[PDB]
Amino acid sequence: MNLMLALLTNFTLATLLVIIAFWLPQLNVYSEKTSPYECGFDPMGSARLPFSMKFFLVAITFLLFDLEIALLLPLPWASQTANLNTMLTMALFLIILLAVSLAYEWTQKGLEWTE
Amino acid sequence: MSMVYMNIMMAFTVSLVGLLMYRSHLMSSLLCLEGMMLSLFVMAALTILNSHFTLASMMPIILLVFAACEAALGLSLLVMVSNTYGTDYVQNLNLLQC
Amino acid sequence: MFMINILMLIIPILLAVAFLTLVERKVLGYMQLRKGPNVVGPYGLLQPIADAIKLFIKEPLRPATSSASMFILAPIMALGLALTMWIPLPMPYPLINMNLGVLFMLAMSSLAVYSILWSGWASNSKYALIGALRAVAQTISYEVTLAIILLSVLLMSGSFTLSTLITTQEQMWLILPAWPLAMMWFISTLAETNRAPFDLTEGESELVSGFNVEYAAGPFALFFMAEYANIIMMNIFTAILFLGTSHNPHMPELYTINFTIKSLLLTMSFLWIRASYPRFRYDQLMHLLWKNFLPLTLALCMWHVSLPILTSGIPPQT
Amino acid sequence: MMLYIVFILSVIFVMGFVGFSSKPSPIYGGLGLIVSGGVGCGIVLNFGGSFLGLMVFLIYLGGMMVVFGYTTAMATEQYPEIWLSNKAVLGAFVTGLLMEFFMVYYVLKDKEVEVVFEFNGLGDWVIYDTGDSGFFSEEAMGIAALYSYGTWLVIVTGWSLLIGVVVIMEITRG
Amino acid sequence: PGIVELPSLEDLKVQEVKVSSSVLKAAAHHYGAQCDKPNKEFMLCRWEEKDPRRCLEEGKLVNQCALEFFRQIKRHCAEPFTEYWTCIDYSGLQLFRRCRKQQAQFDECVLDKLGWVRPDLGDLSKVTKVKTDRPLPENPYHSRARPEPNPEVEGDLKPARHGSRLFFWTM
Amino acid sequence: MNPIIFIIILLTIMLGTIIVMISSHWLLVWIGFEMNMLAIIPIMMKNHNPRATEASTKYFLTQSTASMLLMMAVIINLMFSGQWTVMKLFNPMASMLMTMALAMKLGMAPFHFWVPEVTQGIPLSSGLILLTWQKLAPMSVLYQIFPSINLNLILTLSVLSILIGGWGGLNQTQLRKIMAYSSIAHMGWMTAVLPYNPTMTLLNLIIYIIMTSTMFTMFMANSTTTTLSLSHTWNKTPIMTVLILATLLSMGGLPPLSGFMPKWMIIQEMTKNNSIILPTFMAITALLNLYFYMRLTYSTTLTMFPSTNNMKMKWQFPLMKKMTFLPTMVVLSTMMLPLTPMLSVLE
Amino acid sequence: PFFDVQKRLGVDLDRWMTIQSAEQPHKIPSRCHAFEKEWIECAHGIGSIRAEKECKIEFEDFRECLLRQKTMKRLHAIRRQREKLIKEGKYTPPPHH
Amino acid sequence: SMMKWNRERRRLQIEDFEARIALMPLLQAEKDRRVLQMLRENLEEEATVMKDVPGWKVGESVFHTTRWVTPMMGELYGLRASEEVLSATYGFIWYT
Amino acid sequence: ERVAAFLKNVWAKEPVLVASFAIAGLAVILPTLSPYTKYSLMINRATPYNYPVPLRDDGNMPDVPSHPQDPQGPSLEWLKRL
Ligand SMILES: CCCCCCCCCCCCCCCCCC(=O)OC[C@H](COP(=O)(O)OCCN)OC(=O)CCCCCCCCCCCCCCCCC
Ligand SMILES: CCCCCCCCCCCCCCCCCC(=O)OC[C@H](COP(=O)(O)OCCN)OC(=O)CCCCCCCCCCCCCCCCC
Ligand SMILES: CCCCCCCCCCCCO[C@@H]1O[C@H](CO)[C@@H](O[C@H]2O[C@H](CO)[C@@H](O)[C@H](O)[C@H]2O)[C@H](O)[C@H]1O
Ligand SMILES: CCCCCCCCCCCCO[C@@H]1O[C@H](CO)[C@@H](O[C@H]2O[C@H](CO)[C@@H](O)[C@H](O)[C@H]2O)[C@H](O)[C@H]1O
Ligand SMILES: CCCCCCCCCCCCO[C@@H]1O[C@H](CO)[C@@H](O[C@H]2O[C@H](CO)[C@@H](O)[C@H](O)[C@H]2O)[C@H](O)[C@H]1O
Ligand SMILES: CCCCCCCCCCCCO[C@@H]1O[C@H](CO)[C@@H](O[C@H]2O[C@H](CO)[C@@H](O)[C@H](O)[C@H]2O)[C@H](O)[C@H]1O
């Protein structure tokens, strides 16, 4: 309960601030005021046009690397095992294969952005 | 069964239908694949946690790992599809009818 | 009595955030051979109040091309999540005592990124979009290294509980056995908080205002309050992790004073760093983390798994 | 009302699934998957799996961040579709909610429901264990055993993740 | 499928040991030594019998020994003990290490007045043997009779009669 | 692709298949399929052209969908039995989902649509792996779960696969699409007999793999992928046209060739169980396969098609392709009928 | 397994996690440990065809432990009969309940 | 420094764990009586509510085996105020 | 000689990677040389998460103690001295 009460209070406080922000000030809305900003001149083309991602390969690698830490975060608990010979070997094994995969992507120029 | 299973099984079915009923964007279907795995994770976690199957508690974690390998694989193909045609539309992938 | 405790957490947070804006402008000013706000109230003490009132009576704008619901949602998420980050903090007693407080903080930090992505995307303007996609790159740069840095430290604490870090550091600050990780952690928090020299998602001199360029008045203030709240919260986290304050159960306020001083100085260091350095290029930030911190962080993670086992100093699970 | 916490979260779980399954713009589909991942973490946490719940939320937040980036690059159009903008998307969205709302309405009315298969609606707490007093988390013991019992699992997962990097490099080298 | 046999509310009656966990924790180490015998006879019973209904009598002797143990403390060392568990109760985690001074006062009191020696580190986690006059249960799981195994095939392996015998093949 | 990377990826394709065949745990069976799917995709994309990209995408979407249905069955099985052992399933809904999941992995009808397209879109060497090695893992699972499979479901899939495979190949001029529809037709025989005698499913599987490997190796030897391109073989290497003729007649099931052996042993097992109508229907429908095998033999060996002038340049160069095991495989594809009683080795 | 290399080599790859009554960390038992043990020992060695009928009692109890469908039916019936008497004014719960 | 401190922290954990081991017999004995008492009360009030039901037999098992089976939450707290049910089911998880 | 020539070059060009490999090597190597590693497993074994279920004294278990303070059974004197 304490947790749900705390989250509700925070996000309700934020919502009230927005409600006041919109209903308290005097408004004067017209077309030019609400037009998209681009340093004084009208934009050329929609902002919804495709925006090329030059780090796309690092982004996919992040998915694989971000799952590795899910496998590693239990390590503080795994260190309480009596079978420490196996646990230490498999912990080091997993991290090394992460390093090998990093070294492969590095040496193969996967970490350089497409130009 | 317990009522929670009604909504988790329902969520899996919704995503399965979402996967099988394509629209245009290939990214939208890849999302339905990720949703299907999320329902399987939750459905498996409930069973394992409720039955106190201690060693099975690692199984949902292993499920996520191969979920990411699938998502990464799906995104890799999306990049190539996008490079070829300039969209991720699935109607462009019709060369192999002939 | 719990509701009172909640208010005695978030009202002070927002007041501390408001006066951190004054402190930054004065600290930057004197480092720049000038004074900073000293006219609005004595020594500029009313300046944050003036700015806050100004913004919330300013006209808020909904851009013609914006996605209305997401435009409103993002600032609400930003501030809401920023305040949520504070509830497990042990000062010395957390508002919410969590078994996995560190993991909770990681998850909530990841969710707060979406307030940048959605505000920028919902603005439907090019500078806003460019800012949001810089946040995608920034998150990809630091997130993996940030989690593994914490893991290496927690292999000495033995748990994911924030209060255990106090017990761990009762004899000695963790900064001693893990200053290489402290170095890399400290930089990661600058990137995590979008702070100079990693102020890229806003990047004023490049993107005008980046992800929040279309935001005005109260909605803009919510983003400002969020970022400055996260800057303070991340330095409290740094103080707990690496500069553990001793806790006397019968004089809990001595802990609070000592811990508050440490957190303030770490926050002053953020302003100091902003005054000193040029900005990174956002591809150079990604190469910093992946090509320097990550190889070192992986190696140190291996070391901090082995070291407790080889020295027979594994911490208690409880 | 609080005794039905898992049920309420599971209702929102399905609503998030209907969200992205109707397939609006992937920007909003990602939003629906984040909500479902968030409440899904809440469901698993309420069964005693705090680590599993927080982990799935953390992973899916990272995954949807990448999907967002790829969307603005490769899955965007001039007028991205919300649920109301498209007739096919709206029909699927409404159909999902109505199927969901009727399952909820009838399972609550009868404390039971037949939706193909029989589900009991007494509340989810009834199946819980009654006697816990250990000095550890059973989920944490089970997960940590991956490094002592799961040697074979560690090898195949670690190998698959390494091969995964090798493969995505091959797949995307035109 | 049968009626679950439950003891009557009368049979479940015993004088409870109504003290808080801080009191129990403060006296735990001495209680572990002084009440070892009935305690270990109850725990053998529960693990062998696998039925709370089958160990009620042993459960009561655990309670009776506890009350007798706490009455000795009350008679002889009330004030030193009340100081000790009061210190334990303050801690949110009920930590021993915050009350070594009060623990020493309590420990020396019970030692002088009752000859009670505190168990060493590792003593109370030892697996001990206990002598009991209760008979070892025969079918604690209430197992049915196991199905008989398939009749074993034994003998001398001889060549197949006329080979494979597949259609026309002669070998 | 670096040669070392190609070998590591190939060994991972095999490791995933091996894991499925040696696992006693449903989770490791699922991991084996996932590892196999991850490794094969780069083999499909090896040449990097739009058709390879389309093929790999269609393959990924199909296999990934099947795995989710596969894991759904495993979790439902866990709810209703509380174990993970690879064996009969303890819930009929789980059995259906797993059975469909394996049908999509094999490309059985009516889940067959991907097989012709994917096979056409990838090279011949990759097509060989897809239509041979990739059948092992799903069949090894069916071999262990068949006591709980719904008979009507599995025989329906087998019937539809034989019909759709036979009809589908009649309209094809592309060799890779001819092999694809042939594979669908042969998958049906393997599953049709599975409820009655799993040993005959292995026999058909092994003989199908030998014959299918032989054909692909001969197509690779001459770099032929269409009917007309293959019709020039009589002018380059006459011997290869005779091997193709013998192998194709074998795949048609004609005595006294080896390919008759599985059709013969499957009909025996089905009749022992009083199944008369189904084997009769299956044997007659397999005549469709013989028809479009016979067309290839006509255009390849039993007539001489027009040639081109530039073909004379090829007369002056030898075959350089590895053609690994082709002499052994072709003999096994054709001359094995006298040794039929050796099928007991698979028992 | 299709190929039993684990048995041939006497190496345990995955069967440690196949059943919930196998050895767990710190000897934490599953909730249905006794039921599954009884079923496994009843059906050991006789084959599924025999075990499907000769160990039906053990499997049914094990199934009841796992999913508790019969218990939830029983409790749903009692709770229904209580609301029947509450509205009809024919039963007052006790203080302790 | 961390090695020495973590060694002492491990010796403290053992002392804390052993105090629990000393008290577990008494706690176990209390839990058994309490569980049996709650089940007995549930049985008394089952008879009254379900006296009129045609085919009902009070206290019938769902299990063929006569072995003791640990009750699940609904079995033990099935007929009690939500405040007590909510505390017994979600009290631990929801405690800060 | 090449041992130092290569090492000096990487120290000048990529000291970060030199430090990474040196630290990783020590993690793999030192655990097998340390004399204190054996106590890590003993301490984990001596931690009693579970109840120590007593054994039915059957009349011939001399190595087992009757009371927790009896001389038999494992001791932690080594742990107090660590
Ligand atoms: C054993 C018990 C089990 C029974 C099963 C049946 C066993 C038979 C299995 C056969 C296995 C395939 C191997 C057949 C070997 C054929 C040898 C041959 O055809 O001669 C080679 C010759 C190739 O030409 P070349 O190498 O260049 O020599 C100089 C001529 N240019 O060839 C040519 O030049 C011919 C080119 C013209 C094409 C004529 C095609 C009609 C003749 C086909 C006869 C073979 C039919 C095999 C089918 C099965 C028969 C039962
Ligand atoms: C294949 C030759 C026929 C060619 C025409 C094709 C006919 C149709 C083929 C379909 C299969 C029908 C085969 C019918 C015979 C199989 C049944 C059979 O023969 O009995 C089993 C046979 C042992 O024969 P058995 O009666 O015991 O006589 C022993 C004589 N020493 O054991 C066997 O099964 C193996 C016998 C197979 C028959 C061929 C092998 C005979 C040995 C000669 C091999 C060649 C040796 C010379 C090598 C020359 C090298 C250049
Ligand atoms: C790409 C693949 C990379 C694979 C890399 C694998 C690296 C593995 C390096 C070995 C890691 C473990 O190294 C090994 O750890 C165990 C315990 O932890 C040590 O064992 C030592 O402590 C344990 C208890 O802690 C005692 O049982 C043992 O008697 C004692 O020798 C070994 O002395 C050490 O050799
Ligand atoms: C066990 C974990 C700790 C061990 C370290 C694991 C990570 C190893 C990282 C890769 C090591 C070898 O792989 C890497 O190859 C590339 C070649 O393009 C080199 O990179 C080269 O170009 C890049 C960009 O200009 C720069 O890093 C550098 O100027 C240069 O060395 C790296 O110097 C080398 O580190
Ligand atoms: C591609 C499809 C996507 C949707 C997937 C949905 C999966 C949902 C899985 C639910 C599984 C329910 O499984 C079903 O449960 C009921 C329980 O009453 C069983 O019910 C049957 O068996 C049990 C005992 O064996 C008894 O109730 C009774 O004999 C009979 O009703 C069914 O034999 C079983 O098939
Ligand atoms: C963005 C949209 C989100 C939609 C979310 C939809 C949530 C689903 C609604 C679930 C509502 C559950 O509703 C819950 O039902 C049970 C029925 O026994 C009620 O519980 C009831 O039990 C006893 C019965 O003896 C009554 O005396 C009591 O008055 C009543 O509380 C709860 O008071 C109610 O809260």
Q: Describe it for me?
A:
Chain I: InterPro entries: NDUFA3. Chain I: Belongs to the complex I NDUFA3 subunit family. Chain I: Residues 54-82 are annotated as: Disordered. The structure is cut from a larger assembly and holds nine protein chains of nine kinds. Helix content of chain A is 62%, strand content 0%. Chain A has a single domain (7-107), classed as Methane Monooxygenase Hydroxylase, Chain G, domain 1. Chain A is an all-alpha fold. Chain F contains 18 helices and no strands. Chain F is globular, with a radius of gyration of 20 Å. At the B-D interface, helix 1, helix 2 and helix 3 of B face helix 1, helix 2, helix 3, helix 4 and strand 2 of D. Strand 1 of chain E pairs parallel with strand 1 (55-56) of chain I. One dodecyl-beta-D-maltoside sits between chains F (76, 91-93, 97) and B (9, 13, 16).
Topology:
This is part of a larger assembly, with nine protein chains of nine kinds.
Chain A: H1 2-23, H2 31-34, H3 56-72, H4 75-78, H5 84-107
Chain F: H1 3-22, H2 26-44, H3 50-79, H4 92-106, H5 114-121, H6 124-131, H7 133-145, H8 151-170, H9 175-192, H10 198-222, H11 227-230, H12 233-236, H13 238-251, H14 260-272, H15 277-285, H16 287-302, H17 311-314, H18 326-334
Chain I: H1 2-13, H2 15-33, H3 37-46, E1 55-56, H4 77-80
Helix pairs in contact in I: 1-2
The structure holds 1,2-Distearoyl-sn-glycerophosphoethanolamine (2 copies) and dodecyl-beta-D-maltoside (LMT) (4 copies).
PDB class: oxidoreductase
Keywords: Complex I, oxidoreductase
Entry title: Bovine complex I in the presence of IM1761092, active class i (Composite map)
Oligomer: part of a larger assembly
What structural category do the secondary elements of chain I indicate? mainly alpha
Q: Report the strand count of chain I.
A: 1
Coarse morphology of chain E: elongated
Shape of chain I: rod-shaped
- Strand residue percentage of chain E: under 5%
Helix content range of the residues of chain I, please? 40-55%
H/E series of chain I, N to C?
HHHEH
* Count of helical stretches of chain I: 4
Number of strands of chain E: 1
Which two chains touch over the largest interface? Answer: B-D, 64 and 81 residues
Helix content of chain E: 40-55%
Q: Span from first to last CA of chain E?
A: 59 Å
Distinct small-molecule ligands in the complex: 1,2-Distearoyl-sn-glycerophosphoethanolamine, dodecyl-beta-D-maltoside
Percent strand of chain I: under 5%
Helix-strand category of chain E: mainly alpha
**Count, helices of chain E:** 5
Short description:
The structure is cut from a larger assembly and holds 9 protein chains of 9 kinds. Chain B is mostly helical and 98 residues long.
Attribute tags:
part of a larger assembly, 9 chains, A: 115 residues, mainly alpha, 5 helices, flat, B: 98 residues, Helix Hairpins, 72% helix, binds 1,2-Distearoyl-sn-glycerophosphoethanolamine, binds dodecyl-beta-D-maltoside, oxidoreductase, Complex I, NADH-ubiquinone oxidoreductase chain 3
